[PDB]
Subunit: 394 residues, 5 copies
């Protein structure tokens, strides 16, 4: 009886076009905040943050007021979209095809004319995802909000701290914080200044998934490549091992392209890490070819250089701690015996070449092993957030 | 005649904005339930449950009542969206881009003013999918429902048991149950408490598909890796077999990434199982390199250590149950014969090294076979639901 | 003049909320049928049938009637959505995110008050796709239609045979038929019975595409695996051939997962067929290892068992139809000659082992060839629709 | 002043439900045409043509007429959707989920009551894509348009030639033409005939992209397979080459499945071309096994058949243009010499077998080379549009 | 009080259908510009530019004017869609399924009747993406805008320079500029000329991502192929290396097809670059077969041609800087010695053939290395924007 009566009274002569101020010269104060419930998706390839947010808009409507002693029990009323004036606050950096992802809900108004509006929404925003340090990256995604059509002389937008009390954690992103800033800009369209409120979602990637599915594999594929330097040359499988490892690694790096954006702001950390890993496998194939050249050297070919004889078989090797009728019968047997002696000298020359191959193989094992460790450790720890990541996620 | 007459009468002065209570101070009781018809999709990568549900809302409208003796034959009326007051019950944890997936249908009202509203919908909800025990995982997906704008002082939301009598089973998920709980929370927005109703869909993954397409393959790819320990070394294909098996396995694990979310709450069970499988193939390649080192050992190189001579050729081997002119002619033939004897000693040394390779190869066959079984059995049965899964799905 | 006049008259006092019956106690008869124009997509992974349908609804509106002698030339009128009462017939088992895929069109009404409504639509329905016999599978997809809000006491839904006269055949699915059934169910929501009409689209997969792209390849990859049993062992490539074939086959089976649903109702026919094919390649690698063990047997190792000497070199082999100073010089040459004789005996032992490898290789060629044929023929013909498929598609 | 005045006058008593004819018995003539601006996508897997079209509808509204001497300067007026009667022309064979893709725009009306309506739209239509001759295929995609609810007695739909003057060429499809045909059909729903207008978009695939990315590769993968017949057998890599080529080819054919529909109307041309290519690689592996069998033949095994000795080493080979104490010492040396002679005879037998392998290898090189050329040329030129394609695209 | 009063006054008798001109004969001047905020996506496979734009429309409404001395403090008013006349400016070359991607916002009107309308939107436009020079390509994407229904006699559309002052740079595309052009065309539909405004977004691809992920790999896969010419032939792995490299490269080129459109306007630059790379690997396999033919030549086969003996072992080689009872015993030993001499001559012939293989191998190393460099450098630098790209991105 009193609710029906009040609704009929509150709409009499009410225009949702009118900004609901008592004094038309003064701006209307709109308090804008939001509640962050969930981060639904961070698309690094499309540069789009998807969040579940409850926008919070509160203002005062001069015309929607009543004495609660005359409509007893009616402390609040509710109005749908199109029936009450609302601030036209939009997400400026929207990525939604519809642009406005807000789900329009009721505006709750109490007797003193205070209006509360909390529309939910799945918001897609355009966020510059800096993948320079991926997977140890921290992201700062801005959500800029302001009135589209009402400038600062008509709508005085103020900011209230964002609420994260009902935030649901994400298994992939750690919410560092959601600081907000109110600013007033000028636009070429418009001499009047237009205030906006920007909430910067600060997000730390949780690195357990990427550590075990992307970074530890490369170590394993880098360790497999090093096993070529322990395969004997006579096995006949050092190129099979090395080139198969590089095939696997190339396929592995293709799968990684699915996640990164095709941008040129910087060369990511994963790309540098891949470059190091690529180098280990590519140069182990090059070195493997050299080792096979030494192993399969023709004993009747070019004699072993003096530099090769000393740098490998002496210095490196020590460092590595490797180390009538009867006359005619005589002629035939002597030819057979001299032939055998020639084979003995030739295979001794081959043995020297094979030993040099082993020394080169062992030298490069140590060199590639150490260089693998330094590049892995150096590239990873160059990330500012690596130490934080291992302490919090591992 | 009486239906036309009643519709004209029931809408006279009716305001869909008014909460349809006789006493404005009292809250309106809304009974909320739902019917679960089908689970359409569980997206573990996007963390979203898609269900086909018929929401069930029933309340009493004080103004939509008539005497059936005056409108004979008219026992019920129906009203579309916008013409009758409805509770603004939404899915709080919605993942739909539109947020509200409800398909608006009629409200059915009988003569005593009781209103029934059963809107269908394809609902997308944000469900935390715990993949710690995947593929033997049970999921608890919450569907939280409440009035967006009406707090507890205005809308007294009560819960009624969910209906699963028209539930259509899913080939992938077994519906354990759909328990529901009514709760009343406070929000930072609002001093007034807002009641909600949360239905927890409890779902057990049916594991036949994942057992045959994801878990039994790993056993087969783990068994293929073990066959390297039965290949002769002279075949020249033990690295080809081992490294090809690991290429296959890496490709296999790439395909598995398509299904899991990139989250860091925990390391899944499939990841641990893959880690065990990875270890078998990776260490069988490492052991294969060692076996080839033994097999291809240079007979003029470092003599066999005493530890190697006893630990392998004696202990392990027994355990494994393996086990003038005429003077010049004399000089030539004696050199030929002594040369042959030197080859005999050298190939005897090689035979010892080759036999040690066989013992190491057989030792690691047993060790990797047993360790493969324990890790497979141990990792799988560590899942709480493994025993239930095999009894119900296999 | 008469069309304008009639439209003004027909809408006077008309309420689209009112069920258009003369007697409010009696139900309104609605004849429901449909026209199937095309099957657009059968998504076996999402379990959703997409069809192009023209729903057919016809009823009688008591208020939309006129004498054609007073509005000459006006034999029919047309009304858009919202202006005329329509039955709220929905697809119960809808998979569309909007739930209602119907495109709202005009209702055509003639002078006697008969209303015809033929809204087109791209309908997505939830169909249980039984892949037990894929690719020789027949599907029965139900399309259940009924009034959402009007029960049997208010809307008497009758069924009329579906029309397929403008059906456009699908290159992948053969329309067996579209039988329909009217039924009346009770729901927990509602004491009143609610009639529905279910049209069961019966669809036979056309198997030419799947025969040539999925079943004949497996035969070719099963035939390639058999070629390992004709490769000589000295070629050194029997593991390369066998393990490469299994790599190809594994990749091939990954591509097949894209089409099947991750369900556990049954193990499909293609899975069983893959299991047979998997067995041929996996056991040919196991047998290849055994053949290489025999071929590369150490002539100074364990003597050939008596069971091996008879079961292979006799029975199987026959069945397979294979089959002073001068004294010192004497000592040296005799050692050389005796050494050569020892090599002759040892290589004779090796030749026996190599021959046993050939017999085992030929025995398994026949066994795997026959077993390959039986499993291929047996698994395929176990499908009830295999004979029909080959006669109609091949 | 005169525009405002005219709009108020033209809407007085106007009903958008009324067909705007002076005589209600006569049908209304609607001229239907369209403008083809672009072909946006041809989805051969979903069988859907996406086009950018400007529909062209023109008719005469009897009520929207004025004297331009009384509203000077007002030669035309414009009306939005819902305010003026429009023909309900739809795309019958629509594939859009909404069914109607038309973007509703103004209707332009001049003083004589002539109405022009040119709504743009991104139209998705169901087109039967005949892939029998892909990639040298010509497509005929129908776009059928007619009034949904107005039959021939009420709306006389006439056709006007389609406009392609603003057509933007597609890099993949060459617009042969867009002929149109007006027809009048009967439907089971309706005794009244319903006229339709069907525009057949005739499209020729431009084959440069598919020639270089799909057809020339197969030639290269067919040429690589032929190189197995020039590899020496002692290289030990003829199975590695052949089986790797077939692995590559299988992966290549998987990528091709992404483009073709899973239909059984016919076996496409690319499938036949793949079958030829598959045969070359598969039979080159089979022949490679036979060549290795000949090369690795046991010299103490079955003697060379007489058919083999003549068909290969003579006919084919010519055609191919290949071609006391001292007595005891005597016994030992004679055994050594006789042993060597036995090796010479045995390796001579092996040399004959190795030469037969070379002849078979060279015979199959020529046979597979010629057969490769004929199948490539024969399968490609069997397409009716192959000659046109090479002249226009190459 | 004055805002409420003004809104009631401004809408009195206002018709949003009327073009708001004082003189109905004169056209209405509409100033059209836009603001480019971000380029969201360039889809080269679908030929669609996605941009975030703020359209800028300004005109004068003759009826929406007031004296600010009578409504003090009210300097501007705002009107939503449907309440005020707006120009129906559309994107002609739209690719959006809805066609109109504009988000409708308020029109801001000041006291002198000047109207400002700045609707935001995510616009999808049909852009011809010329991939002739990809990845060093510059794109010119047109965005054509004009009134759909108002021709030049009714709406005089003028252009204002586009604003890029709030443009957010894209990590992949460098905004060269956004020039605009006003033009007036004639259409077959319409005798009246229709003005349009076309803004050409000029975009330069940033090439760092494509240089490191697509162009440098090909160099690495081209360098790996060259390593076959340094592998010894006795290693037995030159076909394994070469054919594995080509497998990797084929897989690499499959991944590249995901990005390019299936168009035939031209053969892209990446395709030509791939053709060069393909040639290096394919001809290195062909040359590898020839080298193996030389290496494995039968010493009892066709003698070395005179051309081969001079062109390789002399010219190329120098250029490359390579370089009673006792009588019977005599017969046996002489046969053994003569047999050994025959082996020495035969292996000397083999050594000559093996040396020729090395020379051919070294000759082709230099030839393929130089030819690889020229094709890489020549194909890349043939792009007009290559020099600009390396200076700006590298
Ligand atoms: C457990 C993991 C495996 C861990 C390690 C590899 C296991 C095998 C190494 C030992 C082989 C035996 C040997 O002979 O070693 C030699 C070299 O050994 C060294 O000096 C260093 C060997 C370790 C290299 C570390 C990187 C391995 C690759 C990554 C591995 C992970 C791959 C990925 C894992 C899935 C020394 O012995 P020697 O030949 O007697 O020396 C000659 C001296 N003499 C003539 C006087 C006798
Ligand atoms: C505007 O109003 C002021 C006072 O209200 C008056 O003096 C002036 O003449 C008016 N001018 C116009 C626009 O008629
Ligand atoms: Ca992410
Ligand atoms: Ca699932
Ligand atoms: Ca299908
Ligand atoms: Ca196409
Ligand atoms: Ca791009």
């Amino acid at each position: 009886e009193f609710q029906r009566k009040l609704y009929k009274e509150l709409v009499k002569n009410y225009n949702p076009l009118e900004r609901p101020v008592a004094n038309d010269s003064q701006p209307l104060t709109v308090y804008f905040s939001l509640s962050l419930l969930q981060i639904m998706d961070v698309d690094e390839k499309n540069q789009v943050l998807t969040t579940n947010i409850w926008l919070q808009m509160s203002w005062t409507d001069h015309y929607l007021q009543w004495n609660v002693s005359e409509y007893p029990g009616v402390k609040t009323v509710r109005f749908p979209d199109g029936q009450i004036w609302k601030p036209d606050i939009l997400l400026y950096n929207s990525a939604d095809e519809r642009f406005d992802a807000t789900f329009h809900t009721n505006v709750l108004v109490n007797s003193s004319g205070h209006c509360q509006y909390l529309p939910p929404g799945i918001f897609k925003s355009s966020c510059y995802i800096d993948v320079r340090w991926f997977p140890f990256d921290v992201q700062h995604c801005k959500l800029k909000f302001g009135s589209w059509s009402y400038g600062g002389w008509s709508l005085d937008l103020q900011m209230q701290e964002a609420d994260i009390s009902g935030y649901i954690p994400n298994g992939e992103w750690d919410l560092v914080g959601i600081p907000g800033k109110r600013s007033e800009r000028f636009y070429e369209c418009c001499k009047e200044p237009y205030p906006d409120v920007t909430f910067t979602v600060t997000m730390r990637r949780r690195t357990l998934y990427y550590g075990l599915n992307l970074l530890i594999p490369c170590v394993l594929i880098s360790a497999l490549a090093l096993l070529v330097f322990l395969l004997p040359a006579d096995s006949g499988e050092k190129i099979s091992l090395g080139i198969t490892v590089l095939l696997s690694l190339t396929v592995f790096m293709l799968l990684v392209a699915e996640i990164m954006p095709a941008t040129s702001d910087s060369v990511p950390l994963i790309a540098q890490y891949f470059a190091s890993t690529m180098i280990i496998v590519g140069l182990s194939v090059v070195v493997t070819v050299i080792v096979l050249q030494y192993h399969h050297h023709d004993p009747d070919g070019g004699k072993m250089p003096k530099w090769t004889r000393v740098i490998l078989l002496n210095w490196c090797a020590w460092f590595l701690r490797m180390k009538p009728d009867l006359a005619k019968i005589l002629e035939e047997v002597r030819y057979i015996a001299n032939r055998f002696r020639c084979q003995d000298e030739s295979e001794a020359v081959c043995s020297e070449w094979k030993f040099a191959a082993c020394v080169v193989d062992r030298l490069c094992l140590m060199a590639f092993s150490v260089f693998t460790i330094i590049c892995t450790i150096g590239i990873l720890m160059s990330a500012p957030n690596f130490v934080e990541a291992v302490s919090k996620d591992f």
